């Protein structure tokens, strides 16, 4: 059957030839072994071959408005990349949540661990008035949990006596993201 | 809502897409490196096959114009072929395998999907990229665009949370998560394909478990969930498909089921009733379904293990 | 010592005092100790 | 109406804004949007009206298909409100009515004696197009759907014609009288009405509000005078009254182009150069207050336009040739990495309701669906409200 | 001899595979003698089966074009997918735009030569020679050198718009040709582009009946 | 340290100054709060510990609480607390939300309950306006402390004087064996427990010389 | 109240304190409360 051959000898010289050359030579990354992606090969794997005072508080409400600029990173998921308006031992941004108490918000934390949503993403005074993150959070969830000693989220506050700022800092540079320890992590950052 | 039609797509490799292909006519189905065998929906006859490149084309998007067809391979590209012309414009992609496509109402610029969870946007007619909305970490498995809008951008992903995006380059418009991460493994991935309501004010998440909790981006609250009478029978998360079916806007809202490993259900708008499905697992079917699209009373279907099911109904 | 023997002397005293705590008389325990005799 | 920016935030319409996105090289004279605000037209000194688009600021080419476009700059390209037709004008003695959905060969080229200053629709049909003449002192009304021919006004030097919201009343400049309004048609011959010689010399533009209220002017000796609009059988009585006249004359020099914003003239930008200010005033409609200015660039811009469904501003820099585009929103990134982080700025102790933490959930997840709301398909709100501004189709660059 | 061995290894490398690359090797090495390959073809119908038939054809195989097949298995090989009802219909209008309308526009460009020449000698005999009078090219005149003569100044015959050197019509008559010139430039540009589009259609239309032969 | 009053000594913030009248120690301050520490520790007796609704969202849940176990929260959170509800009277034991009550109780002062214990069948009651009288236990200083709850301005009232103005038939007529009724109820239990505190203080005074 | 001024109830409580602090608590209350009676008969 010569008549179907002439397409097919072209097809063997076009389809298998010119595609995988244009595929493989213009593979900038290193030759990802992938399945046929409507056959449910998940391959959700860790190795990735893909590219990687009062008015002072009111001032911190407005001055360091966006000292970070949210972005994905190799560090945990969202390295917010702290850009500008940072210095050592200064209040970066008022941690703001929305929950009033330690006992029944511990009941709420028990309800969190049932769904496994947040073991972290609270901040506790533990006298009372543990402060939430996952209902009206400001920059609460975003601050990370690396083993980098960048930040201290502490309870220095005036007047209202419920303000939580990130007070004591060692000075960081642009795009290196704020890490407070919660009070050998799950970072995998190059200090672990 | 009851009929069947003649079927056929050479029954070769896996039936990855059966896009209903809105111009009324011109049904198309993959056969692997052979691509998009044309079937006029009235003539019901095999026609032009466009045959772009090597890897199995995952999904097909029907152009508003109907002149140009874009498929999504596994290797390096998302490939546009002009149905009458000679594939005069394919372009580089992200370095990951592409999975899904859909074009906007104007047909102006296109959306690619991503395995590296970083979807890109592409001006069609000039043929380049504008900026890239990388608001995920694990693969954005499905992306659709509603009919009467080019601003809502769907992110059906394997990060367990929908990320609605702006029109072109507005990063991260809103978000939406499903529930219940720890249950299957390491954070659940129910998200399979999110195809909009026609009026661009609702959205349908099909759980990979198989219960369609259909949402509202307006209130952020879910609307009623269509559930089969049997409990946990339809858990069909893995078996070689991510099955999905679109609404049918015949005269009422009509949700067809993307029901994997079983004959697909049909569901009312408001009541949670079963409709007009057969036990026809022998012909076309054996276990799964793969891709279902609907342009009217005509609604197509293709199954995976019964390769090239090639439907149209009523 | 007397600690244990007073916990061994206490219960009948608590019974009398729980009886007397009701109306709280001005002749309190002169009622009580005779009843504390009348056990054995 | 505002149909989709509802899952953005609360309403952040915010009409005038201050940022640039810069477009492509060919310089033009005037610009215009689709009536659905979808994609943007402009016609260069080459005369090829390179039709662009708002989203993805890149040319889409429909011009010069089989019969070529005209070789001088256009003046007054104007969309049909249908969005299916197209009108051009020219320094090329001609109007070439186009239709994009068509064969792309001019639909009905007409020619004329002197260069046409400007042309617009009367917007009821294809059969209604009214234009201008450098020479004449008469209003040419040009039909297209019936015949490729033109008529007179049958009056007794004509610049700057326009319609109103009510399309059967036509506004006309600098006859014997320096301004007059000409009624219904001259095909179906209808009379003239009240004239008023407002200023000494010729005027530039006669923008009318989309709602049919405001009637601006660009006077020669620098007055911007707005007027309430007059109606059918309410002919003479309205627009005789000077409403709030602009231009605290001292700082600003001569005004180049004027047009109303979205509706009800609620902002009114206009262009002044010669003073080399390059900053444009978003004047208030009624009180006429100073509102903010735009930065622009230090190249002069010649003509401007707003749009209606995306609320941006474009103008062509007369020197640079690029088009300067305004109005970009900022993205609430607080809600970005979290699905439910409705972000509150200050600590509000939430009430923790009577059944909150009262007992564990006890498998109440999915016990009742209890639905009362629908998804149901669109049934044409505001009964008609729109003919959708559909795309040009074009297959090219196969090469 | 050694040629026989070359044929032998070039043959045995296939074993019923897509040996079109090896078919390219066939012509490339030891090009002068091809006699042995047919002598081995006398029995090597097993391993080569596609290229067994393809040994008879020409050495070029890789190109994507041709005339329609001379196989003649039936009437017109099913009439070449119904004789391109789509393409001949879409671009015989190209042949219209090629010959007829293009020749029309060149003739309309040619009319302005005489329309310029009458005005030229009239100007030499100043006044603005207007437009809009080359339409049927009347140039309505008897003896233009004297018909424009001093008796009537405002062109009563061969009437151009102008009174004098008048800028009312800012006459397009001078350099109007540019209109016609960029018009015929768009003609020739769409000519070349659309011929490239024809060749792209042929590049697609070979593949149609080449796939339909394989059904 | 404080002695005179009515169920005062250990409570939380919301039972503040507008409780001074009789018994209104409910909470308008913030909403989720603590049942006020009750007046007495029911060690082994039987009681007509009975409750009232004063002026009325006043849910104002009942409760039986214990020390060395949670008291900042309402009663259902507790280790082994027991309580009731306004909302259709949903019966709440510890760690569960079990069977609702048949009667109607949104009204004022019907749900007036009873108890019984032994020395080393334990019988709770509800007797909600004379009905739903039921018991379930495994026979569980440190007696039963029954205060009432919080949640946005309850109308808190308990009966502490001689009469039971509603459903006094617990005392010598019904709800229990009349000898095992133990009319040593909520207010006289103050007097007897305080006399016991007196005598155990005498024992502690002896322990000053037991050295 | 019964703390600071129940001293009608506690005059002989502090005395029987001294009595069992003196006498052995044997013969438990048949004499011990009776001494408080004889101190309370007045």
Give the dihedral of Cα atoms D143, D144, D149, D150; nearest 10 deg.
Answer: 30
Number of other CB atoms surrounding residue A59 within 10 Å? 12
After which residues, if any, is chain A broken (C to N > 2.5 Å)? 52, 183
Q: Strand locations in D165-220, DSSP E?
A: 170-173, 179-182, 192-195
Sign of CA dihedral D310, D311, D315, D320: negative
Cβ-Cβ contacts under 8 Å, D105 against chain E: none
Number of other CB atoms surrounding residue C35 within 10 Å? 16
Q: Which H/E stretch holds residue D302? A: strand D301-306
E3 burial (CB, 10 Å; 0-12 / 13-18 / 19+) is: middle
Contact criterion met (CB below 8 Å) for D396 and E190: no
Angle between helix axes F188-207 and G13-22 (nearest 10 degrees) is 40
Q: In Å, how far are D157, D196, D223, D274, E152 from D201, measured between CA atoms? A: 11, 13, 12, 19, 35
Contact criterion met (CB below 8 Å) for F148 and F109: no
**Of B219, B211, B145, B142, the residue nearest B180 (C-alpha):** B211
Number of other CB atoms surrounding residue B173 within 10 Å? 25
How crowded is the C-beta side of D333, counted as CA atoms within 13 Å? Answer: 19
F123: its two tokens: 């019988």
Query: Distance (Å) from the C-alpha of residue F209 to the closest C-alpha of chain C?
Result: 10
Number of other CB atoms surrounding residue D338 within 10 Å? 20
Q: How far is residue F101's CA from residue F126's CA, in Å, rounded to a whole number?
A: 10
Contact criterion met (CB below 8 Å) for E172 and D93: yes
- Residue in E18, E71, E73 nearest the CB of A12: E18
Reduced to 3 states (helix: H, G, I; strand: E, B; else coil), residue D395 is coil
Q: How far is residue A165's CA from residue E53's CA, in Å, rounded to a whole number?
A: 83
F85: its two tokens: 């509800």
Cβ <8 Å between A27 and B115: no
F interface with C, Cβ–Cβ below 8 Å:
188, 191-192, 194-196, 198-199, 203, 206-207, 210
G22: its two tokens: 């003196």
Cβ <8 Å between F77 and A107: yes
Per-residue buried b or exposed e for B233-272, using 16+ beta carbons within 10 Å of the residue's own CB = ebebbeebbbbbbbbbbeeebbbbbbbbbbebbbbeebee
Q: How far is residue D203's CA from residue D221's CA, in Å, rounded to a whole number?
A: 9
**Of E92, E116, E63, the residue nearest E194 (C-alpha):** E92
Instruction: Please spell the DSSP secondary structure of B249-302, one letter per residue.
Output: ESSSEEEEP--TTSPPPEE-SSS--B-S-----TTTTSS---B--BSSS-B--B
Contact criterion met (CB below 8 Å) for D26 and D50: yes
Q: How far is residue D259's CA from residue D224's CA, in Å, rounded to a whole number?
A: 11
Angle between helix axes E20-28 and A2-25 (nearest 10 degrees) is 90
Structure letter (DSSP) for residue F76: G
Q: Strand locations in F56-139, DSSP E?
A: 82-83, 92-93
Within chain F, where are the H helices?
A: 188-207
**Of F59, F110, F54, the residue nearest F85 (C-alpha):** F59
G interface with C, Cβ–Cβ below 8 Å:
6, 8-9, 12-13, 20-21, 24-26, 28-30, 32-34, 36-37, 40-41
Cβ <8 Å between E71 and A2: yes
Contact criterion met (CB below 8 Å) for F99 and D362: no
**Of F55, E191, F32, A179, the residue nearest D353 (C-alpha):** F32
Residues with Cβ within 8 Å of residue B238, at least 6 apart in sequence: A40
Per-residue buried b or exposed e for E63-75, using 16+ beta carbons within 10 Å of the residue's own CB = ebeeeebeeeeee
- Give the neighbor-by-neighbor strand order of the sheet with D301-306: D21-22, D323-325, D313-317, D301-306
Contact criterion met (CB below 8 Å) for G9 and F194: no
Contact criterion met (CB below 8 Å) for B74 and B55: yes
**Of A162, A16, A141, the residue nearest A78 (C-alpha):** A141
Contact criterion met (CB below 8 Å) for F14 and F29: yes
Q: Which H/E stretch holds residue B215? A: strand B212-215
D236: its two tokens: 């003479």
Q: How far is residue A144's CA from residue E153's CA, in Å, rounded to a whole number?
A: 92
Q: Do chains C and A touch (3 or more CB pairs under 8 A)?
A: no
CA angle B224, B225, B227 (to 5 degrees): 140
Contact criterion met (CB below 8 Å) for B16 and B73: no
Q: Which of residues 184-223 of B touch D (CB under 8 A)?
A: 197-202, 214, 217-218, 220, 223
Cβ-Cβ contacts under 8 Å, F29 against chain D: none
Q: How far is residue F154's CA from residue B285's CA, in Å, rounded to a whole number?
A: 63
Angle between helix axes E2-12 and E20-28 (nearest 10 degrees) is 170
The DSSP bridge partners found for residue D389 are none
What Rg value do the Cα atoms of chain B yield, rounded?
A: 18
- The set of chains that have 3 or more CB pairs under 8 A with B is A, D, E
Cβ <8 Å between B175 and D373: no
Three-class secondary structure assignment of G1-42: CCCCCCCCCCCCHHHHHHHHHHCCCCCCCCCHHHHHHHHHCC
Contact criterion met (CB below 8 Å) for F182 and F47: yes
Distance of CA F160 to the CA centre of its chain: 11
Quote the longest CA-to-CA distance of chain G.
34
Three-class secondary structure assignment of chain A: CHHHHHHHHHHHHHHHHHHHHHHHHCCCCCCCCCCCCCCCCCCCCCCCCCCCCHHHHHHHCCCCCCCCCCCCCCCCCCCCCCCCCCCCCCCCCCECCCCCCCHHHHHHHHHHHHHCCCCCCEECCCCCCCEECCCCCCCCCCCECCCCCCEEEECCCCCCCCCEEEEEECCCCCCCCCEECCCCCCCCCCCC
Query: Distance (Å) from the C-alpha of residue F195 to the closest C-alpha of chain C?
Result: 6
Residue of chain B whose Cα is closest to the Cα of A73: B137
D365 burial (CB, 10 Å; 0-12 / 13-18 / 19+) is: exposed
- The set of chains that have 3 or more CB pairs under 8 A with F is A, C, D, G
| Phi, psi torsion values for D255, nearest 5 degrees | -100, 135
Q: How far is residue A80's CA from residue A75's CA, in Å, rounded to a whole number?
A: 10
**Of D339, F189, B242, E175, the residue nearest A134 (C-alpha):** D339
Contact criterion met (CB below 8 Å) for D20 and D328: no
Q: Strand locations in F62-139, DSSP E?
A: 82-83, 92-93
First to last CA, chain F: 26
Contact criterion met (CB below 8 Å) for B229 and B210: no
Residue of chain D whose Cα is closest to the Cα of A129: D349
Q: How far is residue B164's CA from residue B215's CA, in Å, rounded to a whole number?
A: 12
Cβ-Cβ contacts under 8 Å, B218 against chain D: 6-7
Q: Do chains B and C touch (3 or more CB pairs under 8 A)?
A: no
Domains and CATH numbers, chain F: 1-211 (2.60.120.920)
Q: How far is residue D183's CA from residue D232's CA, in Å, rounded to a whole number?
A: 9
Q: In Å, how far are F107, F166, F170, F188 from F163, measured between CA atoms? A: 20, 9, 11, 12
Cβ <8 Å between F195 and C18: yes
The DSSP bridge partners found for residue A164 are A95
- Output E147-151 pairs: Cβ under 8 A, ≥24 positions apart: E148/E122, E149/E125
Query: Distance (Å) from the C-alpha of residue A15 to the closest C-alpha of chain E?
Result: 12
Q: How far is residue B16's CA from residue B60's CA, in Å, rounded to a whole number?
A: 9
- Give the neighbor-by-neighbor strand order of the sheet with B203-206: B203-206, B212-215, B222-226
Helix/strand/coil percentages in chain F, nearest 5: 15, 10, 75
Residues with Cβ within 8 Å of residue B289, at least 6 apart in sequence: B241, B243, B245, B258, B259, B260, B264, B301, B302, B303, B304, B309
- Residue in B85, B108, B170 nearest the CB of D56: B108
After which residues, if any, is chain B broken (C to N > 2.5 Å)? none
Cβ-Cβ contacts under 8 Å, B223 against chain D: 371, 373, 375
F interface with G, Cβ–Cβ below 8 Å:
3-4, 191, 194-195, 198-199, 202, 205-206, 209
Q: Which H/E stretch holds residue B156? A: strand B156-157
CA angle G15, G16, G22 (to 5 degrees): 95
Solved by what technique? cryo-EM
B111: its two tokens: 């959306």
Tell me whether D70 touches chain E (CB under 8 Å). yes
Contact criterion met (CB below 8 Å) for D247 and D224: yes
Chain F interface mutation, best of C2, C15, C18, C22, highest count of F Cβ atoms under 10 Å: C18
Q: Do chains D and G touch (3 or more CB pairs under 8 A)?
A: no
Structure letter (DSSP) for residue E97: H
Cβ-Cβ contacts under 8 Å, F194 against chain G: 2-3
Sign of CA dihedral E181, E182, E186, E192: positive
Within E48-150, where are the H helices?
A: 49-54, 76-83, 87-91, 93-124, 144-147
Sign of CA dihedral D13, D16, D20, D21: positive
Residues with Cβ within 8 Å of residue D369, at least 6 apart in sequence: B224, B225, B272
Q: Are strands B109-112 and B119-123 parallel, antiparallel or unpaired?
A: antiparallel
The DSSP bridge partners found for residue A34 are none
E46: its two tokens: 């097993």
Give the dihedral of Cα atoms A113, A116, A122, A125; nearest 10 deg.
Answer: 20
Cβ-Cβ contacts under 8 Å, C10 against chain F: 199, 203
Tell me whether E193 touches chain D (CB under 8 Å). yes
Cβ <8 Å between B49 and E211: yes
Q: Which of residues 203-222 of D touch E (CB under 8 A)?
A: none
Q: Which residue has the tokens 């391979």?
A: B73
Q: Do chains E and G touch (3 or more CB pairs under 8 A)?
A: no
Chain E interface mutation, best of B9, B37, B82, B86, highest count of E Cβ atoms under 10 Å: B86
Residues with Cβ within 8 Å of residue D364, at least 6 apart in sequence: none
Residue of chain G whose Cα is closest to the Cα of F205: G17
Q: Give the domain ranges of chain C.
A: 2-37
Tell me whether B74 touches chain A (CB under 8 Å). yes
- Residue in C26, C33, C37 nearest the CB of G36: C33
Q: Are strands B247-249 and B222-226 parallel, antiparallel or unpaired?
A: unpaired
Q: How far is residue F153's CA from residue B302's CA, in Å, rounded to a whole number?
A: 62
Task: Classify A103 in phi/psi space as left (phi over 0), alpha (psi -120 to 50) or beta.
Answer: alpha
- Output B151-154 pairs: Cβ under 8 A, ≥24 positions apart: B151/D4, B151/D5, B152/B196, B152/B200, B152/B217, B152/D4, B152/D7, B153/B111, B154/B194, B154/B195, B154/B196, B154/B203
CA angle A84, A89, A91 (to 5 degrees): 65
Q: How far is residue E134's CA from residue B90's CA, in Å, rounded to a whole number?
A: 50
**Of B206, B216, B308, B303, the residue nearest B256 (C-alpha):** B206
Cβ-Cβ contacts under 8 Å, F191 against chain C: 21-22, 24
Cβ-Cβ contacts under 8 Å, D354 against chain F: 31, 57, 59, 87, 151-152
Contact criterion met (CB below 8 Å) for F202 and C3: no
Query: Distance (Å) from the C-alpha of residue E208 to the closest C-alpha of chain B?
Result: 7
Give the dihedral of Cα atoms A6, A10, A13, A16; nearest 10 deg.
Answer: -110
F7: its two tokens: 């169920």
E108 burial (CB, 10 Å; 0-12 / 13-18 / 19+) is: middle
Residues with Cβ within 8 Å of residue E125, at least 6 apart in sequence: E144, E145, E148, E149
Q: Do chains B and E touch (3 or more CB pairs under 8 A)?
A: yes
- Output E56-59 pairs: Cβ under 8 A, ≥24 positions apart: E59/E26, E59/E27
Q: Which residue has the tokens 């294809």?
A: D126
- Output A166-171 pairs: Cβ under 8 A, ≥24 positions apart: A166/A91, A166/A92, A166/A93, A166/A95, A167/A89, A167/A90, A167/A91, A168/A89, A169/A86, A169/A87, A169/A88, A169/A89, A169/A90, A169/A92, A170/A88, A171/A86, A171/A87, A171/A88
- Residue in C2, C12, C24 nearest the CB of G20: C2
Resolution value in angstroms = 4.3
Q: Which residue has the tokens 């911190």?
A: A60
Q: How far is residue B158's CA from residue G3's CA, in Å, rounded to a whole number?
A: 70
Tell me whether G10 touches chain F (CB under 8 Å). yes
Contact criterion met (CB below 8 Å) for B130 and B121: yes
Q: In Å, how far are A165, B113, B118, B153, E153 from D333, measured between CA atoms? A: 21, 22, 17, 16, 78
Contact criterion met (CB below 8 Å) for D183 and D235: yes
Binding site listing of E for Zn(2+):
1
Q: How far is residue B89's CA from residue B67's CA, in Å, rounded to a whole number?
A: 13
Tell me whether B49 touches chain E (CB under 8 Å). yes
D375: its two tokens: 């998804």
- Residue in E86, E204, E211 nearest the CB of B86: E204
């Amino acid at each position: 059957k010569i008549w179907q051959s002439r397409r097919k000898t072209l097809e063997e010289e076009k389809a298998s030839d010119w595609q995988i050359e244009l595929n493989g030579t213009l593979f900038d990354s290193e030759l990802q072994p992938g399945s046929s992606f409507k056959a449910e090969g998940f391959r959700k794997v860790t190795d990735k071959l893909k590219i990687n005072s009062e008015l002072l508080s009111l001032n911190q409400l407005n001055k360091r408005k966006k000292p970070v600029m949210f972005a994905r990173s190799a560090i945990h998921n969202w390295g917010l990349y702290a850009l500008d308006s940072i210095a050592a031992k200064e209040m970066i941004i008022e941690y703001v949540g929305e929950r009033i108490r330690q006992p029944v918000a511990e009941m709420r934390e028990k309800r969190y661990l049932k769904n496994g949503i947040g073991s972290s993403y609270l901040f506790r005074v533990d006298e009372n008035t543990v402060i939430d993150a996952t209902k009206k959070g400001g920059i609460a969830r975003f601050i990370n949990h690396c083993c980098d000693p960048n930040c201290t989220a502490k309870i220095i506050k005036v007047g209202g006596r419920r303000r939580i700022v990130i007070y004591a800092l060692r000075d960081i540079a642009a795009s290196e993201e704020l890490t407070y320890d919660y009070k050998p992590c799950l970072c995998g950052a190059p200090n672990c | 809502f009851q009929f069947v039609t003649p079927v056929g797509t050479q029954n070769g490799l896996k039936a990855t897409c059966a896009k209903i292909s809105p111009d009324g006519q011109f049904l198309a189905i993959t056969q692997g490196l052979n691509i998009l065998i044309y079937d006029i929906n009235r003539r019901t006859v095999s026609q032009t096959l466009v045959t772009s490149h090597a890897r199995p084309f995952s999904e097909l998007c029907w152009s508003p114009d109907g002149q140009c067809i874009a498929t999504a391979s596994d290797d390096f590209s998302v490939e546009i072929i002009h149905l009458s012309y000679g594939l005069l414009h394919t372009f580089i992609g992200h370095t990951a395998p592409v999975i899904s496509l859909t074009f906007n109402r104007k047909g102006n610029l296109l959306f690619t999907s991503s395995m590296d969870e970083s979807i890109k946007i592409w001006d069609t007619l000039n043929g380049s990229l504008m900026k890239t909305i990388s608001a995920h970490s694990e693969a954005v498995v499905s992306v659709d665009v509603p009919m009467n809008d080019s601003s809502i951008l769907s992110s059906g992903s394997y990060d367990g949370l929908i990320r609605i995006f702006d029109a072109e380059t507005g990063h991260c418009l809103k978000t939406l998560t499903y529930d219940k991460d720890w249950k299957r493994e390491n954070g659940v991935v129910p998200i399979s394909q999110v195809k909009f309501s026609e009026n661009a004010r609702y959205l349908l998440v099909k759980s990979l478990d198989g219960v369609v909790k259909i949402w509202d981006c307006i209130g952020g609250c879910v609307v009623r969930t269509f559930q089969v009478q049997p409990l946990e029978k339809g858990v069909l998360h893995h078996s070689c498909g991510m099955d999905f079916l679109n609404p049918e806007d015949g005269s009422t809202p009509l949700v067809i089921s993307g029901y994997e490993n079983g004959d697909i259900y049909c569901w009312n708008s408001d009541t949670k009733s079963l409709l007009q499905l057969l036990d026809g697992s022998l012909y076309h079917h054996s276990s799964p379904v793969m891709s279902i699209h609907c342009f009217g009373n005509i609604m197509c279907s293709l199954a995976l293990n019964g390769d090239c099911c090639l439907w149209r109904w009523v | 010592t007397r600690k244990y023997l007073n916990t061994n002397v206490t219960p009948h005293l608590l019974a009398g005092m729980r009886l007397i705590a009701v109306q709280q008389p001005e002749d309190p325990l002169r009622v009580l100790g005779e009843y504390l005799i009348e056990q054995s | 109406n505002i149909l989709l920016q509802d899952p953005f935030a609360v309403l952040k319409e915010h009409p005038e804004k201050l940022t640039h996105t810069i477009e492509n090289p060919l310089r033009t004279e005037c610009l215009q949007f689709s009536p659905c605000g979808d994609y943007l037209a402009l016609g260069c000194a080459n005369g090829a009206l390179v039709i662009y688009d708002m989203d993805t600021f890149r040319p889409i080419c429909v011009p010069g298909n089989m019969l070529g476009a005209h070789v001088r700059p256009i003046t007054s390209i104007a969309w049909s409100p249908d969005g299916r037709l197209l009108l051009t004008s020219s320094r090329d003695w001609s109007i070439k009515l186009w239709d994009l959905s068509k064969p792309s060969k001019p639909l009905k080229e007409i020619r004329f004696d002197s260069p046409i200053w400007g042309c617009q629709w009367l917007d009821a049909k294809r059969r209604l197009c009214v234009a201008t003449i450098f020479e004449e002192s008469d209003a040419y009304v040009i039909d297209f759907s019936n015949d490729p021919v033109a008529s007179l006004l049958s009056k007794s030097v004509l610049v700057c014609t326009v319609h109103t919201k009510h399309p059967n009343i036509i506004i006309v400049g600098t006859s014997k009288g320096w301004l007059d309004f000409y009624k219904f048609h001259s095909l179906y011959q209808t009379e003239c009405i009240h004239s008023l010689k407002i200023t000494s010399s010729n005027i530039k533009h006669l923008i009318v509000s989309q709602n049919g209220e405001r009637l601006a002017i660009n006077c020669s000796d620098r007055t911007i005078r707005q007027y309430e609009i007059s109606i059918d059988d309410e002919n003479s009585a309205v627009e005789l009254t000077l409403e709030h006249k602009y231009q605290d004359v001292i700082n600003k020099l001569q005004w180049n182009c004027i047009l109303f914003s979205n509706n009800t003239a609620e902002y009114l930008v206009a262009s002044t150069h010669g003073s080399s200010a390059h900053e444009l005033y978003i004047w208030e409609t009624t009180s006429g207050t100073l509102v903010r200015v735009l930065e622009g660039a230090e190249e002069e811009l010649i003509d401007i336009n707003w749009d209606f469904y995306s609320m941006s501003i474009v103008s062509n820099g007369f020197e640079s040739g690029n088009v300067y585009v305004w109005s970009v929103v900022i993205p609430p990134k607080w809600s970005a990495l979290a699905p439910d982080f409705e972000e509150v700025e200050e600590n509000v102790d939430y009430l923790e309701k009577e059944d909150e933490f009262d007992e564990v959930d006890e498998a109440e997840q999915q016990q009742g669906l209890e639905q009362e709301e629908e998804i149901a398909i669109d049934l044409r709100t505001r009964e008609q409200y729109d003919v959708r501004g559909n795309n040009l189709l074009v297959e090219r660059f196969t090469i | 001899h050694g040629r026989e061995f070359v044929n032998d290894i070039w043959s045995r490398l296939k074993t019923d595979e897509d040996r079109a690359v090896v078919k390219k090797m066939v012509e490339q090495t030891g090009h002068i003698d091809k006699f042995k390959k047919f002598g081995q073809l006398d029995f090597i119908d097993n391993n080569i089966v596609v290229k067994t038939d393809d040994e008879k054809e020409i050495f070029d195989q890789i190109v994507v074009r041709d005339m329609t097949l001379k196989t003649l298995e039936d009437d017109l090989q099913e009439v070449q997918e119904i004789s391109l009802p789509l393409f001949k219909k879409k671009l015989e209008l190209l042949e219209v735009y090629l010959g007829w309308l293009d020749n029309v526009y060149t003739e309309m460009r040619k009319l302005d030569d005489d329309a310029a020449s009458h005005v030229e000698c009239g100007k030499e005999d100043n006044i603005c020679g207007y437009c809009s009078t080359y339409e049927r090219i009347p140039c309505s005149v008897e003896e233009f050198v004297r018909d424009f003569g001093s008796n009537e100044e405002a062109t009563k015959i061969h009437e151009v718009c102008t009174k004098w050197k008048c800028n009312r019509h800012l006459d397009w008559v001078s350099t109007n040709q540019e209109q016609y010139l960029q018009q015929i430039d768009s003609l020739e540009s769409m000519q070349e582009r659309l011929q490239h589009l024809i060749q792209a259609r042929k590049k697609q239309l070979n593949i149609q009946y080449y796939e339909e032969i394989l059904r | 340290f404080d002695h005179s009053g009515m169920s005062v000594m250990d409570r939380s913030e919301g039972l503040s100054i507008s409780r001074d009248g009789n018994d209104l120690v409910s909470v308008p301050d913030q909403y989720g709060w603590r049942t006020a520490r009750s007046d007495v520790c029911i060690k082994e007796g039987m009681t007509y510990w009975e409750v009232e609704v004063i002026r009325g969202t006043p849910h104002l849940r009942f409760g039986v609480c214990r020390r060395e176990a949670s008291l900042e929260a309402p009663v259902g959170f507790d280790v082994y607390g027991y309580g009731i509800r306004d909302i259709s009277l949903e019966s709440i034991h510890e760690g569960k939300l079990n069977c609702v009550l048949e009667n109607g109780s949104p009204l004022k002062e019907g749900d007036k309950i009873g108890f019984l214990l032994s020395l080393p069948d334990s019988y709770l009651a509800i007797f909600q306006n004379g009905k739903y009288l039921g018991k379930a236990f495994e026979n569980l200083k440190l007696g039963y402390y029954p205060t009432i709850s919080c949640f946005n301005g309850g109308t808190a009232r308990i009966i502490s004087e001689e009469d039971k103005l509603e459903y006094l038939d617990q005392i010598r007529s019904a709800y229990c064996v009349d000898g095992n009724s133990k009319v040593n109820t909520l207010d006289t239990l103050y007097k007897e427990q305080i006399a016991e505190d007196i005598v155990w203080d005498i024992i502690d005074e002896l322990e000053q010389i037991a050295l």
